[PDB]
Amino acid sequence: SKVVYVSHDGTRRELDVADGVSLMQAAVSNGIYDIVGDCGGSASCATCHVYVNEAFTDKVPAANEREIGMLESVTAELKPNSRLSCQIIMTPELDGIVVDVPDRQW
Ligand code: FES
């Protein structure tokens, strides 16, 4: 399934992500270092922060308590559509989803 990562400078990168893989795993596995899973993907850091395109913000599963609490630690601006990419798990239903990588993760 397709996932589009948009850098701060507008650079777009499209990856084919398998079912069950998180957006953080796909990013780090394909050189999108601007996203770094410091904690390893267990919602214990905020370095995998991304902005889910408003066209998918209400499709993807809502953030749980752990994520909501960890989001307050993001270094970039915390927007309404801010999410931790390690919490977004790919499925065919998310094909075409677009996420913007923040200017910084620290
Ligand atoms: S990789 Fe640590 S919260 Fe996502």
Which neighbouring-strand residues pair with 12? Answer: 6
Indicate the SS3 state at residue 39: coil
Q: Which helix H or strand E contains 103, and what residues bound it? A: none
45 C-beta closer than 6 A to ligand 1: yes
Domain boundaries, the chain: 1-106
Work out which ligand 1 atom sits closest to the CA atom of 43. 3
Distance CA 62, CA 68 (A): 10
User: Backbone phi, then psi, for 33, in 5-degree steps?
Assistant: -65, -25
Alpha-carbon distance values, 22 to 10, 15, 77 (Å): 22, 12, 22
Q: Are 94 and 60 in contact (CB under 8 A)?
A: yes
What's the CA-to-centroid distance between 76 and ligand 1, angstroms?
14
Indicate which technique resolved this structure: X-ray
Question: Is 90 a known ligand-binding residue?
Answer: no
What are the start-end ranges of the H helices in the chain?
23-29, 65-71
| Resolution to 1 decimal place, in Å | 1.5
What are the start-end ranges of the H helices in 1-81?
23-29, 65-71
Question: Is 39 a known ligand-binding residue?
Answer: yes
Residues of the chain by 3-state class (helix, strand, coil), percent to 5: 20, 20, 60
CATH class of the structural domain 1-106: alpha beta
* Interstrand relation of 82-84 and 2-6 (parallel, antiparallel or unpaired): unpaired
